[model samples]
Target: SGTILIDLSPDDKEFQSVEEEMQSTVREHRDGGHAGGIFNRYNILKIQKVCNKKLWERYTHRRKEVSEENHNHANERMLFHGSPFVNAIIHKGFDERHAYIGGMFGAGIYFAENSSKSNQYVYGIGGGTGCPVHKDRSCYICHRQLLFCRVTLGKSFLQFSMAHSPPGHHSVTGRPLALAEYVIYRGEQAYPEYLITYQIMRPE
Candidate 1:
């Protein structure tokens, strides 16, 4: 599961570096803008627990509660530097999908690419526009409120992506998408540098 519940201990090295490095960013990010807010990363699983059914509500056809507006927005904003790169925000609530895909019933079609058309991949779930529209669509079309953002354009990032069926939407059916990414702290660097093998599936 791409969903992760974050936990911390005082004895860990990452905990110590959290203050020295993880919290700091280059001038290209939110730190450069007039916005007074700070960027904070979150563990996706904790959010699911926080939203529970309501988080599920953001992507499904169930009617969302009028009360959950503030609750979801606050969380969505956390996953960004300035604002999220790609936001599929929601305005109203409704019930359109009551029938689950028994087998050939439905499919998820979501696309999470950098909003600025950068070489990075970015997407959003609830907390904003991604809420209402994605709740009941296939994963490819709709996603959870896990908005990925960056302040600086040319700089690097720790952004990630996942490929999972809507919650348990594939329980009865067969789910295949199980893509996820996780980070392991490897201490601080002089000028944020790392190496990775990237893959792309572009179509013409």
Candidate 2:
């Protein structure tokens, strides 16, 4: 049997707060602007736990590197840089079960090659956009929110994709498309970047 595991620390109150704040921001943004605010609620919940764990691990590991004066500034920038990446991944297709995990792993390598810096602090932001009538969206820096950004330093990393199936699809025997999710691993201080791979599988 296949199973899904969610890991959240007992001290993850900040994670919850951030989650709520993002949701509220999305609602407000969606209501006020034509641009879509963020991922839908179901997608939001599905990825939250994974995101939180990744962020916490990164932040905790990197926290000691900053001085008091620069610590707050660095952290603030990191938070802003990281959130949108996760949003892009969620929107891409993290919610589907059949998408190719290799796609995400490949994307992470692309992100690293393009965004990684040796000395100066570098930030990369990525996202996707599609015309409502269009079948798919493109991932680019200008259009998509940030998908991969890093402080820089060669480090060990991991990237994987996961998804959930919609209800009654197998029973009804209707063709369904698979959703794709993308994640980028940075060292232990930054939030893991995400990009939704989007529409990889179609019902035959």
Candidate 3:
């Protein structure tokens, strides 16, 4: 009904910067991060088969209303595409290690709740280069841009990862500038309007 809250503030800007950069990298690799790719489509069809057929039908029926807003529909499609993939992989006996990977891949889609213009665009942090905003766009862990999903995973995971470009390089896959653990909270629902919050311990 309302909104949840998630805070991701830290003492060191490097960690935040790296997180932002990593997000950008993911976007680049994903080719504008469209959720309608072949893999995603297959995953969606697979979900329709695995889950309740009616649920998929309902989504299909409402597709027109949802897709009216380009951004809204894009995000919705992404989420729809991702959830099944994540669940299917997890159902196939993927452990937490693999689940994390699956989750990351799942989050890469443009879910309705998380998808937005920010999720689509890669931003440059003024270090003589630019980084895609995948981390910022999607959940830090799962890498989905949905606000709700980001809040959920951000709360569960104590540590998060962010990517950055190497010095004087603009393309993705730059050396990671920072990798650190953080103490975080689930956030107050009324205060921040998100479900996750964090405080940085130190930068490495």
Worst 10 residues of 1 by lDDT: 186-195
Tell me the lDDT of model 2 at 81. 28
Candidate 3 lDDT tens digits, 78-148: 11112223333212311222222232212122222221222332221111122233323222222221122
Say which candidate scores most in lDDT. 2
User: What ranking emerges by TM-score with the best candidate at the front?
Assistant: 2, 1, 3
lDDT of 1 by residue, 1-204 (tens): 123223444455644443222223212222221122112321122111111233333433211221143232211111121113222111111112322232121322222221111111222222223224543211223322322221111111234222322331211111122222221111000011111111121112
Runs in model 2 lying further than 4 Å from the true structure: 1-19, 27-47, 51-58, 68-189, 192-204
Model 2 per-residue lDDT tens digits across residues 78-169: 22222223343333312223223454333232222211110001112222233234412221221222232333222222223222112211
Which residue ranges in model 1 land beyond 4 Å of their true spot? 24-32, 36-204
The regions of model 3 sitting more than 4 angstroms off are: 1-51, 69-204
User: What value does the lDDT take at residue 10 in candidate 3?
Assistant: 44
Model 3 reaches what TM-score against the true structure? 0.18
Clashes of each: 28, 14, 27
Could you say which candidate leads in TM-score? 2
